[PDB]
Structure 1
Amino acid sequence: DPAKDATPYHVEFPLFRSANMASADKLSTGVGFHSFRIPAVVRTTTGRILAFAEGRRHDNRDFGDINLVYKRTKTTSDNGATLSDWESLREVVGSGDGTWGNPTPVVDNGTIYLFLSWNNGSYSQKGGDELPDGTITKKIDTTWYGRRHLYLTTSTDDGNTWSKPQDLTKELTPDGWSWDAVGPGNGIKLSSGELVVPAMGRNIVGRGTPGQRTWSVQRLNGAGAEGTVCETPDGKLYRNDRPSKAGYRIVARGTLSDGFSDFASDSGLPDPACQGSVLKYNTDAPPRTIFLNSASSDSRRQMRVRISYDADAAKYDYGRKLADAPVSGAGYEGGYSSMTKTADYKIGALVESDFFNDGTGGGSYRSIIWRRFNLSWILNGPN
């Protein structure tokens, strides 16, 4: 791999700082957040980087009052290289005391499309959870009021402002569903121009052209709830999803016109039942797909970034442990992740981190780390 010839480069620092941290991130209104979790990142066509997260107001739990927050790089050409290159925290949407989450952006010229999930603030995935005011949650159900909704918000000004989110549940989530998720992480634009956004049991597919997109659903029997998608070097689609039980990533390959294979466990990619991320890096010799998850069947703290050179992303190298370049003072790193390719030819990654001050409890502060590294950094890892 000729990219190994570059000097290894890596930088890493917290970008979304929980309430316990010195420079805890708050909106300009004064509204702060206990925890940030569920990252999504995209480089726009200007080179600006947009980083999204769930701002979890009161504790780290997946329900209750959660706002969709973000940061942009200050300019289109700084590549988020230092903390001072990032704007202050902003909000995409935070209306109501319900949950706005699952950021899943896709860039289309320019327009950034950001798909989100939402639930009512009286409901949770399991039900029976206690809220700050003493209310007990109802379990997410199939009713309009109590089901998981799918929203779309758009930016046509490089992420500066966002349209009021539009509820596309009736159009893009099957009737009768209760739980739902989009991404989280990112959607993609194919070499042939279609937009493909991974979601629970389905792709959301944007046909048409830039400036005139039309959305529909490609259902995928056996897909995960939290999916990732990319275009492999052979031109086909590749779903690499979180499994329902700890063990291994589940994978399927297909096309928009012919559909997908069934999903199968990939024994080369252990996973502890956690979200992952995938990135098409380049098309020229040699073609590369990047994959990032916790490379373990029982821990989220074994984050590993990897490269596949296969036309179908069948097999990956060992890659490199993110712990080889650890961050201090921002918790124990590991969990959900998102990757993009920066305009200065780095991998830019967001990774969850957990202070663990309340163990697995709701009071444990969660932060999100930003990382940049070149391919060389991965390739020069001790395997």
Structure 2
Amino acid sequence: DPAKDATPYHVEFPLFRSANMASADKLSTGVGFHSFRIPAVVRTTTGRILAFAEGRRHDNRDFGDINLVYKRTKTTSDNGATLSDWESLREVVGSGDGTWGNPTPVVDNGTIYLFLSWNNGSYSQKGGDELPDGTITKKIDTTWYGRRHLYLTTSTDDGNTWSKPQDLTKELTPDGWSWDAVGPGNGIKLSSGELVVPAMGRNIVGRGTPGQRTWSVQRLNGAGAEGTVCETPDGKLYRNDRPSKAGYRIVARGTLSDGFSDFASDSGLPDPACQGSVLKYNTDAPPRTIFLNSASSDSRRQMRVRISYDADAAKYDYGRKLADAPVSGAGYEGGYSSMTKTADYKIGALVESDFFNDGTGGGSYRSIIWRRFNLSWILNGPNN
């Protein structure tokens, strides 16, 4: 790999700062957030970077009042290189006291399409949970009212403004479903021009052309609830999903026209049952696929970025531990992640971090860290 010959580069700092932090991120209205979780990041065609997260208003839990928030880089050419290159916190949507989350953006020329999940504010995945106002949640069910919905919002001004979210549940989620999830993380645009967005048990596929996209469902037998999707060097699709039980990532390969080979555990990629991220970095020699998750079967605090050179991304190197360049003052790093390729040929990654002050309980403050690094930084790591 010629990329090893470059000087290693890496910067890292907190980008979404929880309520307990100095410079805690708030909206211009004065509305603040206990916690930020569930990152998503994309580089637009101008070079601007858009970073999305769930703004969890009162505590760190997956339900209740959660708004979809974001930051953009101030300019199209700063590549998010320093804290001062990032705009203040904005909101995509936060109407009602419902849960707006699972940001899953994909760029198409220009337009940024942002897929989201939604549920009513008095429902939760398990049900039986107590909201801050005392009320107890009902379990997510199959009714229109109590089910998880799928929304789409679009921006045609480089993320500055967002369309009123459109409910696409009836069209893009199977009838009879209760729980649902899109991403979180990112969708992709194929060489052949289709948009592919990973979702629970399926791909959401945008055919047509830029400005006239048509959305449909490609079902996937045995796919995870939280999926990632990449186009491998060979031109096929690669689903790399979170497993239902801790152990290893589950993988499947396929194409849009003739489906996917069933899902199987990849023993090279241990995972604690957490979200991960994947990135097509480049196509000419040597062709690279980047993968990021917590490389452990029981902890989320073993974040590891890896490179595969394989045409089907069968095998990854050891890669590098993100703990080799730790951040201070923002909690213990590890959890969900999202990656993009910056316009200055770096990998830009968002990674969850947890102060762990109420343990696994709702009071523990959650922040999100932004990192940039070059391939060299990965390749010149201690254990390869």
Instruction: Give the TM interval when normalised to the shorter protein.
Output: over 0.9
What is the RMSD computed on CA atoms of the aligned residues? Answer: 0.2
Tell me how far apart the structure 2 counterparts of residues 181 and 81 of structure 1 sit (CA, whole Å).
31
- 1:291 shift after superposition: 0.1
1:378 aligned counterpart, secondary structure: helix
- 1:154 shift after superposition: 0.1
2:298 aligns with 298
- Which structure 1 residue ranges, 5 or more long, are not aligned? none
1:323 aligned counterpart, secondary structure: helix
2:291 aligned counterpart, secondary structure: strand
What is the CA deviation profile of residues 157-195 of structure 1, one whole-angstrom value per residue up to 9, with x for unaligned ones?
000000000000000000000000000000000000000
Tell me how far apart the structure 2 counterparts of residues 72 and 297 of structure 1 sit (CA, whole Å).
34
2:170 aligned counterpart, secondary structure: helix
Tell me how far apart the structure 2 counterparts of residues 152 and 34 of structure 1 sit (CA, whole Å).
26
TM-score (norm 1): 1.00
What is the CA deviation profile of residues 112-153 of structure 1, one whole-angstrom value per residue up to 9, with x for unaligned ones?
000000000010000000001110000000000000000000
1:377 aligned counterpart, secondary structure: helix
Tell me how far apart the structure 1 counterparts of residues 42 and 31 of structure 2 sit (CA, whole Å).
25
Tell me how far apart the structure 2 counterparts of residues 284 and 84 of structure 1 sit (CA, whole Å).
34
1:170 aligned counterpart, secondary structure: helix
2:202 aligns with 202
What does 1:300-315 align with in structure 2 at a 5 Å threshold? Answer: 300-315=300-315
- 1:257 shift after superposition: 0.2
Tell me how far apart the structure 1 counterparts of residues 370 and 138 of structure 2 sit (CA, whole Å).
35
1:356 aligns with 356
Number of residues of Structure 1 aligned to a counterpart in Structure 2: 383
- 1:90 shift after superposition: 0.2
TM-score (norm 2): 1.00
1:329 aligns with 329
1:183 aligns with 183
Tell me how far apart the structure 1 counterparts of residues 266 and 301 of structure 2 sit (CA, whole Å).
20
- 1:374 shift after superposition: 0.1
Tell me how far apart the structure 1 counterparts of residues 193 and 289 of structure 2 sit (CA, whole Å).
19
Tell me how far apart the structure 1 counterparts of residues 213 and 98 of structure 2 sit (CA, whole Å).
29
- 1:361 shift after superposition: 0.7
What is the CA deviation profile of residues 44-103 of structure 1, one whole-angstrom value per residue up to 9, with x for unaligned ones?
000000000000000000000000000000000000000000000000000000100000
- 1:211 shift after superposition: 0.6
Q: Does 1:61 align with 2:47?
A: no
1:18 aligns with 18
Tell me how far apart the structure 1 counterparts of residues 61 and 186 of structure 2 sit (CA, whole Å).
22
2:311 aligned counterpart, secondary structure: coil
- 1:19 shift after superposition: 0.2
2:50 aligned counterpart, secondary structure: strand
- 1:319 shift after superposition: 0.1
Tell me how far apart the structure 2 counterparts of residues 257 and 172 of structure 1 sit (CA, whole Å).
18
Tell me how far apart the structure 2 counterparts of residues 31 and 81 of structure 1 sit (CA, whole Å).
27
- 1:267 shift after superposition: 0.3
Tell me how far apart the structure 2 counterparts of residues 361 and 67 of structure 1 sit (CA, whole Å).
20
Tell me how far apart the structure 1 counterparts of residues 261 and 95 of structure 2 sit (CA, whole Å).
40
Tell me how far apart the structure 2 counterparts of residues 96 and 320 of structure 1 sit (CA, whole Å).
42
- 1:381 shift after superposition: 0.1
- 1:345 shift after superposition: 0.1
- 1:197 shift after superposition: 0.1
Tell me how far apart the structure 1 counterparts of residues 156 and 99 of structure 2 sit (CA, whole Å).
25
What is the CA deviation profile of residues 287-334 of structure 1, one whole-angstrom value per residue up to 9, with x for unaligned ones?
000000000000000000000000000000000000000000000000
- 1:277 shift after superposition: 0.2
1:376 aligned counterpart, secondary structure: helix
What does 1:80-119 align with in structure 2 at a 5 Å threshold? Answer: 80-119=80-119
What is the CA deviation profile of residues 212-258 of structure 1, one whole-angstrom value per residue up to 9, with x for unaligned ones?
00000000010000000000000000000000000000000000001
- 1:262 shift after superposition: 0.2
2:3 aligned counterpart, secondary structure: helix
Tell me how far apart the structure 1 counterparts of residues 5 and 214 of structure 2 sit (CA, whole Å).
43
1:259 aligned counterpart, secondary structure: coil
Tell me how far apart the structure 2 counterparts of residues 4 and 191 of structure 1 sit (CA, whole Å).
27
Tell me how far apart the structure 1 counterparts of residues 360 and 23 of structure 2 sit (CA, whole Å).
24
1:260 aligned counterpart, secondary structure: coil
Tell me how far apart the structure 2 counterparts of residues 308 and 210 of structure 1 sit (CA, whole Å).
30
1:145 aligns with 145
Tell me how far apart the structure 2 counterparts of residues 218 and 359 of structure 1 sit (CA, whole Å).
39
